[PDB]
Amino acid sequence: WFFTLIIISSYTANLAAFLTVERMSAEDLAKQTEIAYGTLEAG
Amino acid sequence: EFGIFNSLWFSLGAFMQQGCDISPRSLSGRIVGGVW
Numbered sequence: 001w002f003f004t005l006i007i008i009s010s011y012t013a014n015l016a017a018f019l020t021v022e023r024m025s026a027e028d029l030a031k032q033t034e035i036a037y038g039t040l041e042a043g
Numbered sequence: 044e045f046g047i048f049n050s051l052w053f054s055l056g057a058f059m060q061q062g063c064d065i066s067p068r069s070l071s072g073r074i075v076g077g078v079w
Contacts, residue, residue, distance in 0.1 A: 001055075001056070001059040001061050002059065004059075004061075005059050005060070
């Protein structure tokens with residue numbers, strides 16, 4: 001019963017946080033490296 | 044049927060919202076169950 005009580009509460013609490021969070025530049029492009037950026041050649 | 048071992052079992056079961064195989068029948072027992 002104790003394992004069930006903690007796990008069910010964890011599922012409800014984490015889902016509430018999950019739903020709450022989503023409800024709430026050139027420098028940026030230069031700092032990161034996940035997105036590749038290019039230009040036209042001979043332009 | 045509310046012996047000392049059964050009373051501890053009912054109090055534990057009530058606290059975890061799992062119910063129990065017995066329930067109080069007297070007024071004194073139901074007052075304790077209500078506040079618990």
